[PDB]
Amino acid sequence: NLLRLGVNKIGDIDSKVSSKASYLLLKLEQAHPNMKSIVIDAIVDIALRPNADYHTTYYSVITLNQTILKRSEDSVANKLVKTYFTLFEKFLIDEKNSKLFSALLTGINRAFPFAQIPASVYEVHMETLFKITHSSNFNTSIQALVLINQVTVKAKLNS
Amino acid sequence: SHRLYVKGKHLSYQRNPNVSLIKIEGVATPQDAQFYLGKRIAYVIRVMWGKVTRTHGNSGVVRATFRNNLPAKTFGASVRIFLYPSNI
Amino acid sequence: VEPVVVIDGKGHLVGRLASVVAKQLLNGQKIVVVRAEELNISGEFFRNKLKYHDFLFRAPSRIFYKALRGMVSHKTARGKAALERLKVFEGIPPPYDKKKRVVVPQALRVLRLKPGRKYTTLGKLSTSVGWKYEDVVAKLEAKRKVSSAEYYAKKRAFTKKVASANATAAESDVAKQLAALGY
Amino acid sequence: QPKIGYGSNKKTKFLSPSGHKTFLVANVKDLETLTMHTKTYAAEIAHNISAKNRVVILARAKALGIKVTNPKGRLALE
RNA sequence: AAAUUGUUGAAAGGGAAGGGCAUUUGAUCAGACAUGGUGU
RNA sequence: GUUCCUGCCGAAGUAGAGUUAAGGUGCCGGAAUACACGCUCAUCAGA
RNA sequence: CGUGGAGGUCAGUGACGAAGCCUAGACCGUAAGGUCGGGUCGAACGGCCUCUAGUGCAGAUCUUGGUG
Ligand SMILES: [Mg+2]
Ligand SMILES: [Mg+2]
Ligand SMILES: [Mg+2]
Ligand SMILES: [Mg+2]
Ligand SMILES: [Mg+2]
Ligand SMILES: [Mg+2]
């Protein structure tokens, strides 16, 4: 219940409260790595809500991006990559969008190592990633190119 | 040694930044302080000069007037009181 | 009269000792307090307990520091400077264990508090409020008292030597001629 | 709190630290009213004077030997 | 047009930005007697 | 409701020096933690 | 002291920068304020004698928009 309240305050109206909640959640993960999966699940529980609101999901994606991953946490990384892709399809389906895509690409790049997902999953979004590379915000195109390079290398596409 | 003075402490202001209260060692009574009236005071590098004006209370504390008032951060700072102008 | 004054805490009242020390610090004198655990307060144990509580640092030294800071205008530059001049300790840490320690008569409990009036020891208060170090300090104090007994024996021998030397100086002429002539 | 007891001495009133009473000046003709009172008064060029006129006023003031309170203003800054 | 919101860029900082106080070390600026006369 | 600033008259001032009333002299805070008496420490002590 | 109105006046001020506004700058006045410097401003306006209008705040019912 305490975690529910704390992660609920990610979607607060005031950006200061959301930032404080994100910082405290990241501190909580560091203090107790074992609850990292529970914290990530709780954050996912809000970001995917039908009434999530752009502020809440944006700060939640930031918090998920700033999580730390180890080479034995494939389940957590496999959770995070799928969550990022689901959110990406949710919002793709502009300036506010560009920042959220930047953060989502950052998260997918962070979690693409440590993630044992079939390459075919990324192949579905590959064209979409290229659509980002010519986007208005170059900060998104950098991360899109990073993701494209990583997927191409691991999947051994023609490149 | 070449000391021809007594190093005394600056206590506080009169309460008036113009007047300062000086505590001089080995002076328990106003009668003892009466000797030191008119002597030159020197707070020490830069030096500010002044003089002892009159006694203050029964503890032997004396009043003092400097050409420029002390900066108020010297309460408890060491201050010199020379023997000249001598009256003996 | 000394660059540094070491004041024993035993048998003193917190208010009077703190006031005297604060007055000295404001005059530039450097003072260090030791053996503050055995400091005394007037009243009964409960009343001081609830006073420190309605304040609620658990150590006796910190309680003394608060009491003294109440005198000094700490928020001013001068008050801060007076505060760095101060030092407080429970028991005697080095190197002050090798230095004799004065007593302030104005704050002495024996001279101030009337016989048959309840008082309170700061150590018991600090332990009751959550200071879990009164035990280690006591053993150090016992060792210090053994060392002090040895030092007292050495001082008695030194006083005997001083008496012998004073006798030796007596049978010299120049001092006797000087005293008769003047001084 | 302001009150009459704070009033300054008449002999020292309306005096700059240079010791010269400030007098506003617009043109050369008004400058020439201060020809001899150089000790008592110092000229001050008005704010609305153009740069071309200020140099003429300064030259005439130097010729007369009258102290200008604000020279090098709008010919230099500060 | 204000007020308001968002992307991008610079800087500081820390979980808040934040101030006041003290010390420390530095950098940089202003600082006449144009002293009236005589003498070799 | 209040009524730009200063001054003035009137029912029922600024600065230096000294003195002083009311007060006060444990510290913040300038002054004796001076003296001399009678008391009182009460689970309502007493400022 | 400050704000406008009118008459008179300063052979007033002005692209070599008028009016307006700001100015934790300098000078003056006990103060209301005034003068200058700088910034801003970019085309006209101010000082002075007279008569005539005319000095900054508080709070409530709430209202509206906007945001939760
Ligand atoms: Mg101007
Ligand atoms: Mg940076
Ligand atoms: Mg008077
Ligand atoms: Mg007119
Ligand atoms: Mg103005
Ligand atoms: Mg003035």
Swiss-Prot record, chain A:
Cystine connections: none
Coiled-coil annotated residue ranges, if any: none
Subcellular location: Nucleus, Nucleolus
Family: Belongs to the CBF/MAK21 family.
Assembly and interaction partners: Interacts with NOC2. Forms a nucleolar complex with NOC2 that binds to 90S and 66S pre-ribosomes.
Note: Present with 15000 molecules/cell in log phase SD medium.
Role played: Required for 60S ribosomal subunit synthesis.
Protein name stated in the entry: Ribosome biogenesis protein MAK21
Designated gene of the protein: MAK21
Range covered out of full length: 411 to 615 of 1025
UniProtKB/Swiss-Prot annotation, chain B:
PTM annotation, UniProt: N-terminally acetylated by acetyltransferase NatA.
Phylogenetic classification of the source organism: Eukaryota, Fungi, Dikarya, Ascomycota, Saccharomycotina
Gene Ontology cellular component terms for the protein in this record: cytosol; cytosolic large ribosomal subunit
Family in the record: Belongs to the eukaryotic ribosomal protein eL33 family.
Keyword field contains Acetylation: yes
GO molecular function: structural constituent of ribosome
Keywords assigned by UniProt, alphabetized: Acetylation, Cytoplasm, Isopeptide bond, Ribonucleoprotein, Ribosomal protein, Ubl conjugation
GO biological process, one term: ribosomal large subunit biogenesis
Extra information: There are 2 genes for eL33 in yeast.
Subcellular location: Cytoplasm
Protein name: Large ribosomal subunit protein eL33A
Superkingdom in the source lineage: Eukaryota
PROSITE patterns named in the record: RIBOSOMAL_L35AE
Gene field: RPL33A
Pfam families the record matches: Ribosomal_L35Ae
From Swiss-Prot, chain C:
Assembly notes: Component of the large ribosomal subunit (LSU). Mature yeast ribosomes consist of a small (40S) and a large (60S) subunit. The 40S small subunit contains 1 molecule of ribosomal RNA (18S rRNA) and 33 different proteins (encoded by 57 genes). The large 60S subunit contains 3 rRNA molecules (25S, 5.8S and 5S rRNA) and 46 different proteins (encoded by 81 genes).
Source organism of the structure: Saccharomyces cerevisiae (strain ATCC 204508 / S288c) (Baker's yeast)
Cleavable signal peptide: none
Post-translational modification: N-terminally acetylated by acetyltransferase NatA.
Alphabetized UniProt keyword annotations: Acetylation, Cytoplasm, Isopeptide bond, Ribonucleoprotein, Ribosomal protein, Ubl conjugation
Family: Belongs to the universal ribosomal protein uL13 family.
Record InterPro entries: Ribosomal_uL13, Ribosomal_uL13_CS, Ribosomal_uL13_euk/arc, Ribosomal_uL13_sf
PANTHER family with a match to the protein in the record: LARGE RIBOSOMAL SUBUNIT PROTEIN UL13, RIBOSOMAL PROTEIN L13
Domain of life: Eukaryota
GO MF terms held by the record: mRNA binding; RNA binding; structural constituent of ribosome
Protein localization: Cytoplasm
Keyword flag Amino-acid biosynthesis: no
Any one cellular-component term (Gene Ontology): nucleolus
Keyword Ribonucleoprotein: yes
One of the GO biological process terms: cytoplasmic translation
Glycyl lysine isopeptide (Lys-Gly) (interchain with G-Cter in ubiquitin), cross-linked positions: K161
Residue stretches in coiled coil: none
Protein name: Large ribosomal subunit protein uL13A
HAMAP family: Ribosomal_uL13 (MF_01366)
From Swiss-Prot, chain D:
Tree of life domain: Eukaryota
GO biological process, one term: cytoplasmic translation
Keywords: Cytoplasm, Phosphoprotein, Ribonucleoprotein, Ribosomal protein
GO MF, any single term: structural constituent of ribosome
Localization in the cell: Cytoplasm
Cellular component terms per the entry's GO annotation: cytoplasm; cytosol; cytosolic large ribosomal subunit
Purpose: Component of the ribosome, a large ribonucleoprotein complex responsible for the synthesis of proteins in the cell. The small ribosomal subunit (SSU) binds messenger RNAs (mRNAs) and translates the encoded message by selecting cognate aminoacyl-transfer RNA (tRNA) molecules. The large subunit (LSU) contains the ribosomal catalytic site termed the peptidyl transferase center (PTC), which catalyzes the formation of peptide bonds, thereby polymerizing the amino acids delivered by tRNAs into a polypeptide chain.
Family to which the UniProt record says this protein belongs: Belongs to the eukaryotic ribosomal protein eL32 family.
Subunit structure: Component of the large ribosomal subunit (LSU). Mature yeast ribosomes consist of a small (40S) and a large (60S) subunit. The 40S small subunit contains 1 molecule of ribosomal RNA (18S rRNA) and 33 different proteins (encoded by 57 genes). The large 60S subunit contains 3 rRNA molecules (25S, 5.8S and 5S rRNA) and 46 different proteins (encoded by 81 genes).
Name of the protein described by the UniProt record: Large ribosomal subunit protein eL32
Species of provenance: Saccharomyces cerevisiae (strain ATCC 204508 / S288c)
Full protein segment contained here: 52 to 129 of 130
